[PDB]
């Protein structure tokens, strides 16, 4: 009643848009009415499709039991079993919420082919959402890499000047690494004859084989979070992909790596995850520290936002690999909070400034609060949210992730507290420059934030504050599901 309805409705939605727009393509030299106002009636139908997708998961949410251990809403479809637990439920909701937001971001800033863009966006949202509700490794990998084909074409068609380089980076970095994860999946299907989540969690493999499987899986995950030193693709992709592509990539795709740790490493390779935890912390701590310092020297406006996501997800990787409930819950809270603040920073940079001046260099902008006060209000508020200031969901996620890290490793896990200072260093230096001093001599006075851009910023800000002030909305769902991932024998 979930995956069957979600796939069938969206497939029908894809067919409906294709039939309408491509009916008169037969060298008719026609004008037609669907294409009037930049294909408004075709963008509207796709926007309605994204909204309905949210209602589909809400109907199943009503029947969700937070006191039930194990997967719920178990369903067989396409010879694949699908299920939902506490962790999967929240990540699906975040993915579907960003659907309409991504479409609304590129409402009237594309040079054409809106129908192709709308179908690609909705296809990506569903494929990523389905990746949270699959119950085997093979189905996980199929949806993990199926998003590459729509995303490669989306970046190469609607991208910026260097779209060709960005399309090659995302296609090759995320495929060459995921193939190493496929090797570990193939090994599971050879020695156990199954890749089911429940089946493989109860099997203990040899300590040498678990080391080989962990390395294969972690390569695909580490590239996708991303972690240093396999992170160089992400700044290029964000700086060239369209705004809607950046929102999905920053808001959903990077969260699949954290969810991949939950499904593919913790419950099935528990013994080797404990051994690898010091190594993961060292890589993630250096990823956090180095990315913050590298961000201080960047001149591209959208690249600065791209590096900020790397530092935050390093905290998520640190928290999710802590062997206590505090670190695990905090990592999941930070992923949800990052799923809203990070797209907003791209919207402010790549959707408001870029759509007016079309230049992403930092030297052209200063003193924007003089003639764009509404823009500066959101820019300052989202800057403090991105830095982990309290009352925002990022602070709840960061504090619990740091606390869980210290509980897991008091000595080296204490270094995660440097995110409080380092994140404010690069984020505020950008915000202080964009709002301080006199208005830029290289800019002409133009419109402030419009109603459409106000809507995008407000409804990304609201979930962050609600989670920040009352995170018990999220913790209650996660507590039973997250408690299963802990491996300890206290005697």
């Amino acid at each position: 009643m979930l995956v069957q309805n979600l796939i069938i409705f969206n497939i029908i939605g894809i067919v409906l848009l294709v039939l309408l727009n491509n009916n008169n393509n037969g060298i008719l030299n026609k004008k037609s009415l669907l294409t009037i106002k930049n294909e408004l009636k075709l963008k509207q139908i796709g926007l309605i499709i994204s909204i309905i997708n949210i209602l589909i998961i809400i109907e199943n949410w009503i029947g969700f039991n937070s006191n039930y251990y194990g997967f719920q809403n178990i369903e067989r479809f396409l010879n694949i079993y699908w299920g939902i637990d506490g962790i999967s439920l929240l990540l699906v909701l975040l993915t579907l919420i960003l659907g309409p937001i991504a479409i609304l971001s590129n409402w009237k800033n594309l040079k054409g082919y809106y129908t192709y863009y709308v179908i690609s966006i909705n296809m990506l949202v569903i494929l990523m959402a389905l990746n949270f509700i699959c119950l085997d490794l093979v189905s996980f990998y199929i949806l993990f890499e199926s998003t590459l084909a729509p995303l490669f074409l989306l970046i190469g068609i609607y991208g910026a000047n260097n779209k060709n380089k960005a399309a090659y980076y995302v296609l090759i970095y995320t495929l060459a690494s995921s193939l190493f994860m496929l090797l570990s999946i193939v090994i599971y299907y050879i020695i156990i004859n199954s890749t089911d989540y429940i089946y493989i969690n109860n099997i203990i493999l040899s300590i040498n084989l678990q080391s080989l499987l962990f390395i294969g899986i972690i390569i695909g995950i580490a590239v996708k979070t991303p972690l240093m030193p396999v992170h160089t693709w992400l700044p290029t992709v964000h700086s060239e992909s369209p705004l809607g592509g950046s929102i999905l990539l920053a808001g959903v795709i990077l969260k699949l790596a954290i969810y991949g740790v939950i499904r593919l490493l913790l419950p099935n390779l528990s013994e080797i995850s404990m051994m690898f935890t010091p190594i993961i912390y060292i890589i993630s701590i250096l990823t956090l520290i180095y990315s913050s310092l590298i961000t201080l020297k960047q001149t591209d406006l959208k690249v600065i936002i791209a590096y900020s996501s790397i530092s935050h997800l390093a905290v998520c990787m640190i928290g999710i690999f802590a062997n206590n409930l505090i670190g695990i819950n905090g990592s999941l809270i930070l992923c949800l909070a990052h799923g809203f603040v990070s797209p907003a920073l791209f919207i402010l940079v790549g959707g408001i400034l870029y759509d007016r001046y079309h230049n992403r260099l930092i030297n052209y902008y200063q003193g924007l609060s003089t003639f764009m006060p509404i823009f500066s209000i959101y820019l300052v508020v989202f800057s403090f949210c991105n830095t982990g200031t309290p009352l925002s969901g990022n602070f709840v996620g960061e504090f619990l992730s740091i606390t869980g890290a210290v509980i897991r490793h008091p000595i080296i896990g204490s270094l995660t507290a440097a995110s409080v200072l380092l994140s404010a260093c690069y984020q505020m230096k950008l915000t202080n420059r964009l709002t301080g001093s006199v208005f830029s001599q290289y800019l002409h006075i133009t419109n402030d934030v419009t109603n459409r851009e106000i809507f995008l910023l407000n409804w990304l800000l609201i979930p962050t504050i609600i989670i920040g002030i009352y995170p018990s909305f999220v913790t209650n769902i996660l507590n039973l599901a997250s408690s299963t991932l802990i491996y300890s024998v206290l005697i």
Partner: protein, 506 residues
């Protein structure tokens, strides 16, 4: 059915007058012959009855369930190929009349189909030499069917010499086995599998490796495929691999009885080199058929890893991979032939010369296909993403099953290498996709009144005239959706592969 109908077509073609219309109608007669052959073969041959294996013609031929599946695949793929020459591919006389110019086109194809089907069935070293030459000679004639083309005759000359050397190696291997044992029947030879020089069978495989363009003998295959016409390259680059790879699997099945580790290492060494050349070779090329030739070499290497393992999972992997690769091979070449109608007409720098035999010869000739025909461009994109291995397309499951057999049998080095080679080959695969679509938004507001299709006269200015004929467009539509929607019926198809037995039984 094939032999009897071939003789009738030979006599009939030489009696009626020489014309393009009669040749096309004779091509349709050949289509009916292959369809009738498929119906007769399906009526008498079943998977369950052939599981044990049945000898024929004084044990010179041996048919089992593994052999029968490939024969059915060979007939089906040949049906789709005849549709190219039995119907219009572009609807333009200046382009399509090349297929109707040679009357012996359908005759030579029927000669080769007999060789292709009987080759996996060989049970004697004498008939093995006879059939492999019957298949080889038919390929030389088809490569030289356009005898007015300098490149076609040059390629056939190259094809003849390389294949003749391979045939000599095959003959030299079989003669050496006869000297050691004195027996010609394979089943009799299997009685002495532990007392004959097993490296003589490696000499036999070396001759077969040449005929499939395996490294280090890859060079001639790439040269021949690029020079030959697209209608000829579509056949000679796929059909020989359907039969020879099946025969190689049977020979490797017999070799694994003694399990010579040295034999496996030599074949592993050739597979390793073929993945290096197959991946890095296509990175710097400008011809589409040259790119596909490297793609063909790489994919054969993937299948050889399954063949080398030679286990129960290998049967599932090989049967699935060969079927889906053939459908992708047909789909890509079908699109290439059609999209020649969107080529701009000059009305110069680099003095580029394009002939009627290969209207599409460079990768950049596929520019603006997203604008020219969005449905055809997506169909090509689906096919290319299948060759890359993007799930849930047919290509991913082929590589997924090959990896299962490779890692189960302990080929860790080859499995890791095949995945690095897949990533390297994705670079030139993505280049095709870049040419198709990456300039759509800048060329959307462009005017193209100089395309080839624009030269086609209209009927009455009110008839809705399709740009593509009914048959070729339907085949592309069917093959594209089968590649795309394999997840719907993937579970049942593999269950069919579960029942294909090569003397497994229990």
């Amino acid at each position: 059915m094939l032999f009897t109908s071939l003789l009738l077509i030979i006599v009939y073609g030489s009696l009626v007058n020489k014309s393009h219309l009669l040749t096309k109608l004779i091509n349709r007669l050949g289509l009916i012959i292959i369809i009738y052959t498929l119906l007769i073969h399906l009526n008498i041959n079943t998977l369950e009855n052939l599981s044990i294996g049945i000898n024929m013609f004084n044990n010179l031929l041996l048919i089992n369930s593994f052999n029968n599946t490939i024969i059915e695949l060979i007939l089906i793929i040949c049906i789709l190929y005849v549709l190219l020459i039995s119907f219009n591919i572009t609807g333009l006389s200046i382009i399509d009349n090349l297929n109707y110019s040679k009357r012996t086109f359908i005759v030579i194809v029927l000669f080769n189909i007999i060789g292709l089907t009987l080759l996996p069935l060989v049970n004697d070293i004498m008939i093995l030499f006879i059939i492999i030459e019957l298949q080889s000679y038919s390929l030389y004639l088809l490569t030289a069917i356009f005898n007015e083309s300098h490149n076609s005759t040059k390629s056939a000359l190259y094809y003849f010499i390389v294949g003749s050397i391979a045939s000599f190696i095959i003959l030299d291997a079989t003669v050496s086995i006869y000297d050691d044992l004195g027996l010609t029947n394979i089943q009799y030879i299997l009685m002495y599998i532990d007392k004959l020089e097993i490296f003589d069978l490696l000499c036999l495989l070396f001759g077969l490796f040449i005929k499939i363009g395996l490294a280090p003998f890859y060079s001639y295959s790439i040269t021949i495929y690029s020079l030959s016409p697209t209608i000829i390259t579509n056949y000679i680059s796929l059909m020989p691999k359907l039969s020879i790879l099946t025969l190689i699997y049977i020979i490797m099945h017999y070799i694994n009885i003694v399990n010579n580790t040295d034999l496996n290492y030599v074949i592993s060494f050739l597979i390793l080199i073929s993945m290096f050349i197959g991946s890095f070779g296509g990175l710097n090329v400008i011809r589409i058929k040259t790119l596909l030739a490297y793609s063909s070499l790489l994919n054969v290497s993937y299948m050889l890893l399954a063949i080398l393992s030679n286990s129960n999972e290998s049967i599932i992997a090989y049967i699935y991979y060969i079927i889906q690769y053939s459908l992708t091979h047909i789909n890509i070449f079908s699109i290439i032939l059609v999209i020649s109608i969107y080529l701009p007409i000059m009305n110069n720098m680099l003095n580029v010369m394009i002939t009627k035999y290969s209207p599409i010869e460079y990768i950049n000739q596929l520019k603006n296909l997203f604008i020219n025909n969005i449905f055809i461009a997506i169909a090509l994109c689906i096919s290319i993403f299948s060759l890359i291995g993007i799930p849930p397309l047919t290509g991913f499951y082929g590589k997924y099953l090959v990896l299962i057999s490779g890692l189960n049998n302990g080929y860790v080095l080859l499995s890791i290498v095949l995945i690095i080679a897949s990533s390297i080959s994705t670079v030139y695969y993505a280049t095709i996709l870049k040419v198709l679509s990456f300039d759509t938004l800048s060329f959307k507001d462009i005017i193209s009144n100089n395309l080839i299709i624009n030269t086609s006269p209209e009927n009455n200015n009110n008839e809705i005239k399709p740009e593509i004929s009914n048959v070729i467009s339907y085949v592309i539509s069917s093959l594209t959706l089968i590649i795309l929607l394999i997840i719907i019926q993937y579970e049942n198809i593999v269950k069919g592969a579960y029942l294909v037995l090569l003397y497994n039984w229990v």
